[PDB]
């Protein structure tokens, strides 16, 4: 929409925070103080609509994205 | 039963170790003679190896007598073995492990379930020791216990090739081995191989101790070095010849260095990747032994 | 165990299950015999219906060896039960019991 | 007189699983319709076992 | 001592062991199965494997 | 499109917690009349800003 000339900042925050208010990232809220969320595996099923297996894995139980220890993230 | 000498079972002529050259039974030494090594710009530096697992795999419910030297010895040099992992049965070994066990490991390499008539076979002690350790191969396969299969090789490399000072000092230049040969000499001698008693090394390797044991390490130095010789031209990324005057000299390039290849060739006896675990397990397994 | 080929992805597929629990109710001498083999349906199940609780059980271990003294020593590893395994020592691990 | 011990016990059993199936996450319209009907079947043999 | 391989020398040897396989082996036979088709082609999944 | 996004970001249906706040599922799932006797409710009569 603009070829040639910097897009103005109110277009561009007005559009990234839209879109921003767009995008959720499937989980579950917990109590321990051990947890992460496992962001690249939640962005990343978002990103395929939650159709691959690992996208699927995530639907059905967001709480699997939840670790502890890094590793077991993904061996889970 | 046959009773265990002062010396290992190897101090018997019943199971002498001797590969077929110039027309005459050569003992593997006088093979090894006939290497030389041309040593090129990279390093062989050896790591410590990793400790064995402390876990022994179940010998599962076999009502029949597995033969288990032929398995080890074609896993290990055979012309047409593979997926040497499928069947599982080195896990067998095991069945040897426990104290007291109805089971016998014959000459013939036969594990029986049961002591059984006109059938020979070793000091069910030292059987027990040997496969305290060896029963371990069963898990080459499987995935958390799996050896690796560069690494050691840096090992095998050191014994094989290696010079006393070099041998010392832990760090060798990778070296192409070389030596005047006939037609055919790597299938020869893997053939030559396979016939061989293993057991009967690996049995004394593991069950004898002390001056009695070590008197062991260097009487058989040569024979580990066969076996370790045939290992690797099983991994060598290339065995070219080369004339010279009228005599054809045999170059494998390189000694310690596993390549990882896997497509077949005349020129050597070839690894699948069920093989290069299997003989890596064996290698970790054997070294482990053999350094103490 | 006559091979089931489910997959358990409608929940339709309960039935199986089911039919393995009428099994074990009315025949538990031949459910005994055949647990194994129905236990690799329902890791196809737990799998799909409990992925966390799964990931946890499965990393304890598929199997059991009870010992001298009677304590179970799980296996710590995965792996599918060939009925090649009830002559064995071996034992599945959905059916140890063990909280 | 009446109540039979065993036919008890399978109602926990499908009472469990009512409360498996009911647990279930679906995605597609007709899993979540053939989550209701299961129940409802389940609900039925309930009483063939009775 | 270990016998000399055959085919090592030049010499030609009339009586020799051959391995071969009883009734019970075969080989080459056409061998059943049971194929089980997916229950719903939407539920197949072909990625991440 | 735009407004959808981020209508449904916020989740196809809700169900009343037992405080009264409403909980939005955050999922785009197809609704079914199974889900009428369900603790859920379809997003769109929400009538929550
Ligand atoms: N899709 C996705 N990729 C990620 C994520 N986090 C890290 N990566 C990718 O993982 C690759 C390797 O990760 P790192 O070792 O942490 O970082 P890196 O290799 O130095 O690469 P960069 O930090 O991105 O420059 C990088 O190329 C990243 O693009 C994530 O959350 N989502």
Same mark, same amino acid.
């Given at each position: 929409?603009?070829?040639?000339?910097?897009?103005?900042?109110?277009?561009?925050?007005?559009?990234? @925070?839209?879109?921003?208010?767009?995008? @959720?990232?499937?989980?579950?809220?917990?109590?321990?103080?051990?947890?992460?969320?496992?962001?690249?595996?939640?962005?990343?099923?978002?990103?395929?609509?939650?159709?691959?297996?690992?996208?699927?894995?995530?639907?059905?139980?967001?709480?699997?994205?939840?670790?502890?220890?890094?590793?077991?993230?993904?061996?889970? | 039963?046959?009773?265990?000498?002062?010396?290992?079972?190897?101090?018997?002529?019943?199971?002498?170790?001797?590969?077929?050259? *110039?027309?005459?039974?050569?003992?593997?030494?006088?093979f090894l003679?006939l290497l030389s090594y041309e040593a090129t $710009?990279? $390093?062989?530096?050896?790591?410590?190896?990793?400790?064995?697992?402390?876990?022994?795999?179940?010998? =599962?419910?076999?009502?029949?007598?597995?033969?288990?030297?032929?398995?080890?010895?074609?896993?290990?040099?055979?012309?047409?073995?593979?997926?040497?992992?499928?069947?599982?049965?080195?896990?067998?070994?095991?069945?040897?492990? %426990?104290?007291?066990?109805?089971? =016998?490991?014959?000459?013939?390499?036969?594990?029986?379930?049961? $002591?059984?008539?006109?059938?020979?076979?070793?000091?069910?002690?030292?059987?027990?020791?040997?496969?305290? /350790?060896?029963?371990?191969?069963?898990?080459?396969? /499987?995935?958390?216990?799996?050896? *690796?299969?560069?690494?050691?090789?840096?090992?095998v490399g050191?014994?094989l090739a290696g010079?006393?000072?070099?041998?010392?000092?832990?760090?060798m230049?990778v070296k192409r081995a070389k030596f005047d040969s006939?037609?055919?000499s790597l299938?020869?001698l893997?053939?030559?191989?396979?016939?061989?008693?293993?057991?009967?090394?690996?049995?004394?390797?593991?069950?004898?101790?002390?001056?009695?044991?070590?008197?062991?390490?260097?009487?058989?130095? *040569?024979?580990?070095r066969?076996?370790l010789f045939i290992?690797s031209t099983?991994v060598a990324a290339n065995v070219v010849?080369?004339?010279? /005057?009228?005599?054809?000299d045999r170059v494998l390039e390189y000694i310690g260095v596993?390549?990882?290849?896997?497509?077949?060739?005349?020129?050597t006896?070839?690894? *699948? %990747?069920?093989?290069?675990?299997?003989?890596?397990?064996?290698?970790?397994?054997?070294?482990?032994?053999?350094?103490? | 165990?006559?091979?089931?080929?489910?997959?358990?992805? +409608?929940?339709?597929?309960?039935?199986?299950?089911?039919? !393995?629990?009428?099994?074990?109710?009315?025949?538990?001498?031949? !459910?005994?015999?055949?647990?194994?083999?129905?236990?690799?349906?329902?890791?196809?199940?737990?799998?799909?219906?409990?992925?966390?609780?799964?990931?946890?059980?499965?990393?304890?271990?598929?199997?059991?060896?009870?010992?001298?003294?009677?304590?179970?020593? !799980?296996?710590?590893?995965?792996?599918?039960? +060939?009925?090649?395994?009830?002559?064995?020592?071996? !034992?599945?691990?959905?059916?140890? +019991?063990?909280? | 007189?009446?109540?039979?011990?065993?036919?008890?016990?399978?109602?926990?059993?499908?009472?469990?699983?009512?409360?498996?199936?009911?647990?279930?996450?679906?995605?597609?319209?007709?899993?979540?319709?053939?989550?209701?009907?299961?129940?409802?079947?389940?609900?039925?043999?309930?009483?063939?076992?009775? | 001592?270990?016998?000399?391989?055959?085919?090592?020398?030049?010499? &030609?040897?009339?009586?020799?062991?051959?391995?071969?396989?009883?009734?019970? &082996?075969?080989?080459?036979?056409?061998?059943?199965?049971?194929?089980?088709?997916?229950?719903?082609?939407?539920? &197949?999944? &072909?990625?991440?494997?």
């Open positions: 929409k603009y070829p040639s000339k910097a897009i103005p900042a109110d277009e561009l925050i007005d559009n990234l @925070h839209s879109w921003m208010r767009s995008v @959720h990232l499937l989980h579950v809220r917990s109590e321990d103080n051990t947890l992460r969320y496992n962001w690249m595996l939640g962005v990343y099923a978002r990103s395929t609509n939650y159709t691959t297996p690992v996208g699927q894995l995530v639907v059905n139980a967001p709480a699997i994205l939840n670790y502890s220890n890094p590793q077991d993230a993904f061996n889970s | 039963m046959l009773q265990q000498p002062t010396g290992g079972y190897t101090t018997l002529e019943q199971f002498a170790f001797t590969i077929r050259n *110039d027309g005459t039974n050569a003992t593997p030494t006088q003679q $710009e990279n $390093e062989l530096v050896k790591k410590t190896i990793p400790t064995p697992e402390t876990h022994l795999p179940s010998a =599962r419910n076999v009502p029949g007598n597995v033969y288990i030297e032929d398995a080890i010895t074609q896993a290990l040099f055979g012309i047409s073995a593979q997926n040497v992992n499928a069947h599982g049965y080195f896990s067998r070994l095991s069945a040897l492990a %426990l104290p007291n066990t109805s089971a =016998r490991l014959g000459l013939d390499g036969v594990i029986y379930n049961s $002591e059984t008539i006109n059938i020979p076979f070793y000091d069910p002690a030292a059987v027990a020791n040997f496969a305290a /350790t060896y029963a371990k191969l069963g898990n080459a396969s /499987t995935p958390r216990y799996r050896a *690796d299969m560069i690494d050691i090789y840096a090992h050191l014994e010079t006393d000072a070099e041998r010392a000092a832990g760090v230049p006939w037609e055919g299938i020869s893997s053939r030559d191989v396979v016939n061989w008693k293993i057991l009967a090394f690996l049995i004394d390797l593991c069950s004898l101790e002390g001056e009695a044991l070590r008197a062991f390490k260097t009487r058989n130095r *040569d024979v580990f066969m076996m290992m099983a010849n080369r004339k010279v /005057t009228k005599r054809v596993n390549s990882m290849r896997t497509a077949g060739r005349t020129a006896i070839t690894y *699948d %990747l069920s093989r290069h675990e299997f003989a890596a397990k064996f290698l970790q397994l054997t070294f482990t032994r053999w350094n103490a | 165990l006559k091979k089931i080929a489910e997959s358990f992805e +409608d929940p339709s597929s309960i039935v199986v299950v089911l039919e !393995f629990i009428l099994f074990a109710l009315f025949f538990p001498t031949e !459910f005994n015999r055949i647990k194994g083999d129905i236990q690799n349906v329902l890791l196809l199940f737990f799998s799909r219906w409990y992925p966390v609780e799964y990931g946890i059980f499965v990393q304890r271990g598929a199997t059991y060896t009870i010992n001298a003294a009677g304590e179970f020593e !799980f296996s710590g590893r995965n792996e599918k039960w +060939d009925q090649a395994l009830y002559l064995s020592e071996h !034992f599945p691990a959905l059916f140890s +019991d063990v909280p | 007189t009446v109540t039979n011990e065993f036919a008890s016990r399978f109602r926990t059993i499908v009472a469990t699983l009512a409360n498996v199936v009911n647990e279930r996450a679906v995605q597609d319209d007709m899993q979540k319709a053939t989550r209701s009907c299961t129940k409802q079947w389940l609900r039925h043999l309930e009483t063939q076992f009775d | 001592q270990v016998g000399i391989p055959k085919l090592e020398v030049d010499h &030609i040897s009339f009586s020799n062991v051959v391995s071969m396989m009883t009734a019970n &082996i075969r080989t080459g036979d056409d061998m059943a199965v049971e194929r089980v088709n997916p229950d719903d082609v939407r539920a &197949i999944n &072909i990625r991440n494997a």
